[PDB]
Amino acid sequence: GWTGKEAPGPNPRVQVLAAQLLSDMKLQDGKRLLGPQWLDYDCDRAVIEDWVFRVPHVAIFLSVVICKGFLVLCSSLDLTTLVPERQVDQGRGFESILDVLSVMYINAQLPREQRHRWRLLFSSELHGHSFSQLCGHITHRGPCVAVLEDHDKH
């Protein structure tokens, strides 16, 4: 259900996700990639080998580009806990703020026990633009992820 709409042109959430993984790229100097001198580092096997150790998703994403088109069914991975299941009630045409690379980002930092199903609790374009509806739909429903987008696309 998480079909985040691709943009004609480049998807802007592919771009800002990919540079996040390169923030954990700790060069041997101890100082992070800062300024326009971040393009010219002789990054040998000494420095990429902790990057695949620190970042789990660059180790995860290679196991789904290879082992899903090639269709090896014996694979002992979990795809229920990588991408959650979008549970909205039917009948209501509802697009979300968050596309699939974003909901694969927030789902990584949750507890592991909850990562399989994201159910709709409140949304401003379906349940009104009221705080009395917000406080009535999200009270007493367990742990939930509030996510909002202002006028400046933040």
């Binding site: 009221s130 705080f131 009395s132 509806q133």
Partner: peptide, 8 residues
Amino acid sequence: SDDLLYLE
């Protein structure tokens, strides 16, 4: 919760 909405 619908009832507070007529007071907002």
